[PDB]
Amino acid sequence: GFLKLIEIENFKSYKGRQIIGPFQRFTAIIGPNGSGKSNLMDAISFVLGEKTSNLRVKTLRDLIHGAPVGKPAANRAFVSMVYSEEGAEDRTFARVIVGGSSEYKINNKVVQLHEYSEELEKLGILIKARNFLVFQGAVESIAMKNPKERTALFEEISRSGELAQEYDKRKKEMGSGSLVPRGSGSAKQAFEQIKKERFDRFNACFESVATNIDEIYKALSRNSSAQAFLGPENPEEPYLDGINYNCVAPGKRFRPMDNLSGGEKTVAALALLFAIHSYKPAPFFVLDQIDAALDNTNIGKVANYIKEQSTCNFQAIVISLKEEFYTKAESLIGVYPEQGDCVISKVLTFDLTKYPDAN
Amino acid sequence: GAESISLLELCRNTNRKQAAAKFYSFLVLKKQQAIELTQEEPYSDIIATPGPRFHGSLEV
Ligand SMILES: Nc1ncnc2c1ncn2[C@@H]1O[C@H](COP(=O)(O)OP(=O)(O)OP(O)(O)=S)[C@@H](O)[C@H]1O
Ligand SMILES: [Mg+2]
């Protein structure tokens, strides 16, 4: 499905009730400095169950408009997402700040955060993995991440990590931690069994991503000389060690990784992001200024990949400072400030498809 | 000398990049309080009227 629109009321700088969108398959959010683009990023995170600790505040009520100067405009606020699916009625997911607590709703019916997150998971929205959100200043670290942190991501998405606790317990029960592990019979077989379950869960995800990432890193760079390899440091027990990620930049010779430019790191990171999507597709990506280190050649290639993917596979919501990128979107959401006690954010919508992308 | 400016009218017979720049300039001009902006509903025309701060070079 797709995110049809966001509705926001008194959330951070978004004073009053505002409709954000409707979104097209490729929509760019733009606006002058400090107008409130990030705050919109946070509103999406918020309605998707993100923790208050990650929303740039210290307590929930600070998300209410006017809190940072002691002028809260209401005792309540909300963000609501209208999720759409062909052949299906619209579904509305809302998170409301009431008192000092969050209330979760699906089609205006109260649900607990557990059911809320379970419902979003069934759509491909993983609140914990967060593989559909790339925050400002973070796209590069996705390709420079430590191998062991890459494994943690695969354990979360694959659910193999749900088996880790029992794995460790059985490993120690069969002799692990002794000077000479004597693994005999029943305890050894119980460990081999959980080992195999964890292996199977992990590889059902990792194999799919590893065998799809090369074509995507090609189709991203659109050159046959580019190559992408995902390999486990421990092939027998991949979940135990790191996942190595190496690339051959397009048209160039191999250079490690951490040696690459910010731009090449970006394309490699997006390659990994879209390869994860090929296994467990999310309905939409929200990408905050991922074009910051991209030159114009790579901007075109990333934008073209999105466009040739926004019809069928997924929807893309990007926040961009670079006209080279956002002029390739179908429509623009422009954020602007209104004068007041604190910053007030409002938005305009502009359809770019009315105009020839030519001369 | 106009009472109001229609973004869609300004963007008639422009290409995508020019149109996007005019749209972005409305956002900047509103931040500068050179204009007030109205948009009736999402994706309708965007109408600018004089804002509470003077601005030079508004014929551009
Ligand atoms: N509850 C709130 N009420 C009013 N303003 C808020 C609230 N929470 C955050 N803000 C303001 O949001 C403004 C910045 O929000 P952002 O979304 O980060 O703007 P921005 O356009 O992304 O700025 P950049 O990325 O540095 S150019 C700050 O001035 C905050 O004071
Ligand atoms: Mg920002």
SS3 state of residue A270: helix
Measure the CA–CA gap between B10 and A62, rounded to whole angstroms. Answer: 41
Measure the CA–CA gap between A141 and A137, rounded to whole angstroms. Answer: 8
CA–CA distances in Å: residue A68 to residues A139, A237, A252, A346: 29, 49, 50, 18
Q: Kindly list the residues from chain A whose CB atom is less than 8 angstroms away from the CB atom of residue B13.
A: none
Measure the CA–CA gap between A173 and B55, rounded to whole angstroms. Answer: 77
Contact A302, A220 (CB under 8 A): yes
This PDB structure is determined at a resolution in Å of 1.9
Which one-letter DSSP state was computed for residue A33?
T
Which one-letter DSSP state was computed for residue A126?
-
SS3 state of residue B60: coil
In our burial notation (b when 16+ CB lie closer than 10 A, e otherwise), range A264-288 reads bbbbbbbbbbbbbbebbebbbbbbb
Which one-letter DSSP state was computed for residue B59?
T
A44 CA distance to ligand 2 middle (Å): 14
CA–CA distances in Å: residue A63 to residues A23, A66, A172, A291, B28: 24, 8, 46, 28, 26
Measure the CA–CA gap between B18 and B12, rounded to whole angstroms. Answer: 10
CATH class of A1-132+282-359: alpha beta
Other Cβ atoms within 10 Å of B58 Cβ, number: 13
Does ligand 1 come within 6 angstroms of the Cβ of A345? no
Residues followed by a gap in chain B, C→N > 2.5 Å:
none
Domain A1-132+282-359 and domain A144-176+185-280 have a common topology:
yes
CATH class of A144-176+185-280: alpha beta
Mention every residue, 6+ apart, whose C-beta is less than 8 A from residue A145: none
Contact A330, A351 (CB under 8 A): yes
- Position A321, amino acid: L
Distance from B15 to chain A by nearest Cα, in Å?
5
In our burial notation (b when 16+ CB lie closer than 10 A, e otherwise), range A66-104 reads bbbeeebbeeebbbbbbbbeeeeeebbbbbbbeeeebbb
Mention every residue, 6+ apart, whose C-beta is less than 8 A from residue A120: A48, A49, A93, A126, A127
Measure the CA–CA gap between A154 and A244, rounded to whole angstroms. Answer: 12
Following CA atoms A204, A207, A209, A213 in sequence, which dihedral angle do they give, to the nearest 10 degrees?
A: -170
Determined by X-ray
Contact B47, B4 (CB under 8 A): yes
SS3 state of residue A283: coil
In a mutagenesis test of the A interface, which of B27, B29, B38, B45 is the best target, namely the one with the most A β-carbons within 10 Å? B27
Token pair belonging to A252: 């160039």
Mention every residue, 6+ apart, whose C-beta is less than 8 A from residue A164: A155, A198, A239
Strand order in B35-39's β-sheet?
A: B5-6, B46-50, B35-39
Q: Kindly list the residues from chain B whose CB atom is less than 8 angstroms away from the CB atom of residue A356.
A: 15-16
Residue B34 sits at φ, ψ, to 5 deg, of -70, -25
Measure the CA–CA gap between A165 and A32, rounded to whole angstroms. Answer: 48
Measure the CA–CA gap between A11 and A64, rounded to whole angstroms. Answer: 5
> Looking at the complex, does the CB of residue A320 fall below 8 Å from at least one CB of chain B?
no
Distance from B20 to chain A by nearest Cα, in Å?
7
Following CA atoms A29, B6, B45, A323 in sequence, which dihedral angle do they give, to the nearest 10 degrees?
A: -20
Measure the CA–CA gap between A359 and A45, rounded to whole angstroms. Answer: 39
Q: Where do the domains of chain A lie?
A: 1-132+282-359, 144-176+185-280
Other Cβ atoms within 10 Å of B45 Cβ, number: 13
Segment (H or E) for A144: helix A139-144
Measure the CA–CA gap between A142 and A150, rounded to whole angstroms. Answer: 8
SS3 state of residue A102: strand
SS3 state of residue A335: strand
Nearest to A127 by CA among A114, A112, A109: A114
A223 labelled as ligand-binding?
A: no
Q: Kindly list the residues from chain A whose CB atom is less than 8 angstroms away from the CB atom of residue B43.
A: 22, 331, 349-351
Segment (H or E) for B9: helix B7-11
SS3 state of residue A265: helix
Interfacial A residues in 195-224 facing B (CB < 8 Å): none
Contact A60, A78 (CB under 8 A): no
SS3 state of residue B53: coil
Q: In order of start, what are the domains of chain B with their CATH numbers?
A: 5-50 (1.10.10.580)
Contact A105, A93 (CB under 8 A): yes
User: Which residue in B has a C-alpha nearest to residue A5's C-alpha?
Assistant: B42
Token pair belonging to A327: 């002029």
